[PDB]
Design a protein around this nucleic acid. Structure first.
Ligand SMILES: [Mg+2]
Lengths: 49, 241, 119
RNA sequence: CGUUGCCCUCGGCCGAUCGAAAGGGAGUCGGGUUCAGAUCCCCGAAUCCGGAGUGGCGGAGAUGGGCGCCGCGAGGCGUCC
RNA sequence: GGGGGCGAGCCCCGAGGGGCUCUCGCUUCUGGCGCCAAGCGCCCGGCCGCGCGCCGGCCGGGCGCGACCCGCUCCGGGGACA
């Protein structure tokens, strides 16, 4: 991402209301990689990214 | 048999992250247009703020059975409509030069409508009963009226619907209504209503004057307070007692 | 008992009516001022214009600047009872839209040229 | 069968609009022709895009397999998928 | 607020169960799929057969649950100070 030292991560979820694959731009946690899953919420497991 | 094997169930788990959620009602979480949103949160302010008693008294409206008596009694004394007005004039013009024209005959009694027609005939003690509407749009038109009524000793009630009060007359709304007189046949009915009315309104006007009544909270907050009170209660009740 | 499925509240699709004018604003319609005539001003008779006529089966006109090829075609057909293959307009640096008009091969251009006056 | 009126049914967007003869952007080339124009005129070969209703025509969809009869046999009919 | 119950803590219990408190609203091994309802329940229009037709078949629809109920600020965080 030009003008930024951090790399980003296109992370795609599934909208839970419309059949539709919503996507985001997270700033990449170091040790993230592609074909990884990225869980998020209250009951999220305490691992990286 | 009349039961296909093939037919299955196929039930959908509406979990989290599972089968995409069903199209449930969202009436609560809709984003409303700024007119709607306002009229709703005007009503709330009236409940949330400390409403003073001259305005609060209009919450205390008449009870269903009494209202249906009143509207039945008024059905006798609705004012003359159009067409009726023409027929009253037309019959008189024919009778003048035909078979003796007296002129004044004898006019029946009828309702008195707008605040100004009424307030003169509470100043003048011409009224026997006064009905007021509870939902006049700028309140100030009808605020003094019940205090003025109680000063002059005129039984007054507050009915629901400036519209339904105004449908006695044949105009959209009406603020007030009043009976100056009533026919001898219907006389005892009015006097039955009157006494029942003044018990509930004019003969407790001191309690009305003092009775403030907004100052409620949002149930969502009320419930939060009660839960804390149950925590404070269980902190010092089950321990000792 | 009609539930809001969606959290938006879009404006409802009201009835809307056609115009039913209690009177017509303008008394009667404007007459067309770009007729079969007013579209074709005159024929060129220039050396280059006659060479076009004699060799290419065309007639070379000056035309009203507002005209489409469609209109010219229709005018040329109407005035001279003729029939066109194609119209091929340009604008002169002078202001007068010129038009080269190829007549269909059943017709000779020099024959019509003699009919209309030019040669 | 169209065309429209009404009723229901469905529909996220994202900002109206303007902004490039060098950005993006379907499809045209050879020969001839003029005092001065040519991928533009003429000759010849093409090509895209839109329409094509009543569908203009072919071809594809699609013309199997079974069983029952009758026929020397090629086959014909009846009936089942 | 109740339902639901796999279950856990407590209380009751007649060991069948009930109540309060928690818990979920149920998805973590893989660079998949995932919407426009199955299922059940109750109604009607037409057609056909039994003929008593909300009996049975054929064709076509509607509503309810499925997908608890009620409520007054959309949800958060501030806040009588900014
Ligand atoms: Mg532009």
């Amino acid at each position: 991402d030009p003008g930024r030292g951090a790399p980003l991560a296109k992370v795609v979820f599934r909208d839970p209301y419309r059949f539709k694959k919503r996507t985001e731009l997270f700033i990449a946690a170091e040790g993230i990689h592609t074909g990884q899953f990225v869980y998020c919420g209250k009951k999220a497991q305490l691992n990286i990214g | 048999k009349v039961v296909n094997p093939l037919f299955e169930k196929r039930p959908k788990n509406f979990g989290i992250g599972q089968d995409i959620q069903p199209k449930r009602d969202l009436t609560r979480f809709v984003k409303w247009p700024r007119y709607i949103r306002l009229q709703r949160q005007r009503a709330i302010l009236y409940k949330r703020l400390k409403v003073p008693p001259a305005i609060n008294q209009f919450t205390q409206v008449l009870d269903r059975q009494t209202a249906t008596q009143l509207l039945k009694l008024a059905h006798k004394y609705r004012p003359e409509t159009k067409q009726e007005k023409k027929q009253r004039l037309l019959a008189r013009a024919e009778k003048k030069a035909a078979g003796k024209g007296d002129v004044p005959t004898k006019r029946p009694p009828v309702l008195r409508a707008g605040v100004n027609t009424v307030t003169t005939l509470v100043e003048n003690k011409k009224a026997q009963l006064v009905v007021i509407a509870h939902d006049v749009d700028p309140i100030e038109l009808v605020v003094f009226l019940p205090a003025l009524c109680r000063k002059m000793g005129v039984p007054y009630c507050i009915l629901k619907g400036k519209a339904r009060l105004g449908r006695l007359v044949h105009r959209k709304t009406c603020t007030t209504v009043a009976f100056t007189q009533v026919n001898s046949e219907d006389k005892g009915a009015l006097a039955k209503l009157v006494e029942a009315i003044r018990t509930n309104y004019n003969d407790r006007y001191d309690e009305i004057r003092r009775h403030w009544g907004g100052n409620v909270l949002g149930p969502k907050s009320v419930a939060r307070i009660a839960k804390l009170e149950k925590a404070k209660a269980k902190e010092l009740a089950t321990k000792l007692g | 008992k009609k539930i809001r499925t969606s959290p938006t509240f879009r404006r409802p699709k009201t009835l809307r009516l056609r115009r039913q004018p209690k009177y017509p604003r303008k008394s009667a319609p404007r007459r067309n001022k770009l007729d079969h005539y007013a579209i074709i001003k005159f024929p060129l008779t220039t050396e280059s214009a006659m060479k076009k006529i004699e060799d290419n089966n065309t007639l070379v006109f000056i035309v009203d600047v507002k005209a489409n090829k469609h209109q010219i075609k229709q005018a040329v057909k109407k005035l001279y009872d003729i029939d066109v293959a194609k119209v091929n307009t340009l604008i002169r640096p002078d202001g007068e839209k010129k038009a080269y008009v190829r007549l269909a091969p059943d017709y000779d251009a020099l024959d019509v040229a003699n009919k209309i006056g030019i040669i």
